[model samples]
Target: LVPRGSHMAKKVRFYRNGDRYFKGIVYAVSSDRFRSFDALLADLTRSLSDNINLPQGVRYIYTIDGSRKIGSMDELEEGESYVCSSDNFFDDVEYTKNVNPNWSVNV
Candidate 1:
């Protein structure tokens, strides 16, 4: 078992879909607790069951840089928030600008 309350690599917030926050939940997603990326996603799926249902399972987990799909726990930087969902993730502005340079809109 992993020990508790020692290090500072603690607390990363996880959101549902786009901006639907879990409100007050916090977790210590560390290597000591999770063996792999799938392991972490499984736990997250379980914890999120109250408000979420995964018919086909989560397809992506994204940080601030939406194009980057987190493939491992090591890829999750400390204290950074993440988004997990069955839908694909992409940075709207980044994706839009790449396709059309003249595109601009107030978010």
Candidate 2:
């Protein structure tokens, strides 16, 4: 691990099923990720699991209606009433300036 003074870790935000669950946010990261998406998902899952109880399994899976996408959070967003409704949606990164922003979600 780097020195405690090292400013390397990145902060992310995770919105638990706030409406039903509790309004919680968690950030556990250093940058992007490795080759396989499994580890990345594991990290997110572990982080959320430790701090929040997201429904379903430890999967970084997102969808709109019935459409689905993975490996990356394309249209995924956090919160409810608009971006989130009856369906449960989640955000991948939180307060991160590291992303190039080539892609984004309206929510």
Candidate 3:
């Protein structure tokens, strides 16, 4: 299990037709404990475009504590997803928290 207060590698998977592709950050952590679903979706959308591609039928899958499967797009408490910009996705909370502490937050 991932240690509390530690970060884990988080990934977003996109599927088109029957194929799946994944993009991940090696050490992701939440910006705050009480992040909203819309916020998370925005981050995911951005990450996909900037770091990877957004396949049709794209959905998100997240892993917590390194190994435990925490949840996914449908499982998220927030019910809807947003379209986020590629630049913002790489600079947003997830990438900033995971890829580099020095990552800029300005979108």
Candidate 4:
């Protein structure tokens, strides 16, 4: 399980074969930001479970998609939509950056 609010995490896509089974590529290293070359290498390294040798500062993001067939090797078609980042973290991060230093939510 990946941390919810980590700036180093990213989304990984996999092909589904059957119930509760999905295989996709995962990044082997963490990046300073999304869609970077460093991040791409990280992802390539973790594509295979046998080569689970992750480089330094690398992390794995595991997400379960219940709405779609996530286990078929052929199901994950090219250009198909898959993988998504946890948006809650983004919202919180933005909120903190936009809020005043003295401001506080009275929740």
lDDT winner among the candidates? 1
Error of 3 at 24 (Å): 2.3
Candidate 2, superposed: residue stretches over 4 Å from native: 1-32, 55-57, 63-67, 71-107
How many pairs collide in each candidate, listed in order? 0, 2, 1, 11
Q: What would the per-residue lDDT of candidate 1 be over residues 1-107, giving only the tens digit for each residue?
A: 55633334545666555433334235787657776678878887776644434444555777745656777766776566666666674434321222212223459
Q: Write the per-residue lDDT of candidate 3 for residues 1-107, one digit (tens) a residue.
A: 42332232332322111112222432233334315445555555554543235532124343321222234333422211222232222121232222223333468
* TM values, all candidates: 0.61, 0.33, 0.28, 0.20
Best by TM-score: 1
Cα error, residue 90 of model 4, in Å, equals 16
Tens-digit per-residue lDDT, 44-104, candidate 4? 3444333222323222222233343232222333323233222211111121123223323
lDDT, residue 55, model 2: 44
Span of 10 residues, lowest total lDDT, candidate 1? 94-103
Error of 1 at 8 (Å): 7.3
Between candidates 1 and 4, the lDDT winner: 1
Better lDDT candidate (1, 2): 1
Per-residue error (Å), model 2, residue 45: 1.1
- Against the reference, the lDDT scores of all candidates come to 0.58, 0.37, 0.32, 0.31
Decoy 3 TM-score against native: 0.28
Model 2: per-residue lDDT, tens digit, 1-107?
Answer: 43332334333344333223434344433324322345556655554554335444355443322244434432233321111211345443332234233234568
Spell out the clash pairs found in candidate 1.
none
TM accuracy, model 1: 0.61
Which ranges of candidate 1 are over 4 A from the true structure?
Answer: 1-10, 19-21, 50-53, 89-107
Instruction: Sort the predicted structures by TM-score, highest score first.
Output: 1, 2, 3, 4
